[PDB]
């Protein structure tokens, strides 16, 4: 019961409720049937303070959902730069691959998030990572018409 409530409070950005639920014993690593954890939903919905308190209560920074997406994938795809930085600071795996073979760098490129691409690169993103169709972040940029990103990535190896 409490796990499902915690997931919702994290998604919704209800800071007091998140803290009350954890204190009542809600599993910070509870998962729904898509494999979403409170950390996934706080990251995707841009709730940085909630991301931080979840991490302090033992949330698994590298938990994978049913599609293989981790909290860092979620923050990167959704353009949340500050959350990306917090997750990296807590050891999020910069080169985690989802079920399609996409790393956080691939998803940042797909959704056009230049700052996040820069930060992932600085934190050691494998620029040569290939997805299930052999595509790099550079290829994804070209496919999605993100020419400024393509410019940045084209000469990297």
Q: What would your notes on this structure say?
A:
This protein has a single domain (1-157), classed as Serine Threonine Protein Phosphatase 5, Tetratricopeptide repeat, CATH 1.25.40.20. The relative contact order is 0.11. The protein contains ten helices and no strands. Helix 3 runs parallel beside helix 5 (71-77) and helix 7 runs antiparallel to helix 8 (114-122). It has helices at residues 2-12, 15-23, 38-44, 48-56, 71-77, 81-89, 104-110, 114-122, 137-143, 147-154. The protein has 157 residues and is an all-alpha fold. It is classed as de novo protein. The entry lists the keywords Protein Design, DARPins, DE novo protein. The assembly is monomeric. The entry is titled "E3_5 DARPin L86A mutant".
């Amino acid at each position: 019961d409490l796990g499902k409530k915690l997931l919702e409070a994290a998604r919704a950005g209800q800071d007091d409720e998140v803290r009350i639920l954890m204190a009542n014993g809600a599993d910070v690593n509870a998962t729904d049937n898509d494999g979403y954890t409170p950390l996934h939903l706080a990251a995707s919905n841009g709730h940085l303070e909630i991301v931080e308190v979840l991490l302090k209560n033992g949330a698994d920074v590298n938990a994978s959902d049913l599609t293989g997406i981790t909290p860092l994938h979620a923050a990167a795809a959704t353009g949340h730069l500050e959350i990306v930085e917090v997750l990296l600071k807590h050891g999020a795996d910069v080169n985690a691959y989802d079920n399609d073979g996409h790393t956080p760098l691939h998803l940042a490129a797909k959704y056009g998030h230049l700052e996040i691409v820069e930060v992932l690169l600085k934190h050691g993103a494998d620029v040569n990572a290939q997805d299930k169709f052999g595509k790099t972040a550079f290829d994804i940029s070209i496919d999605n018409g993100n020419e400024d990103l393509a410019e940045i990535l084209q000469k990297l190896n």
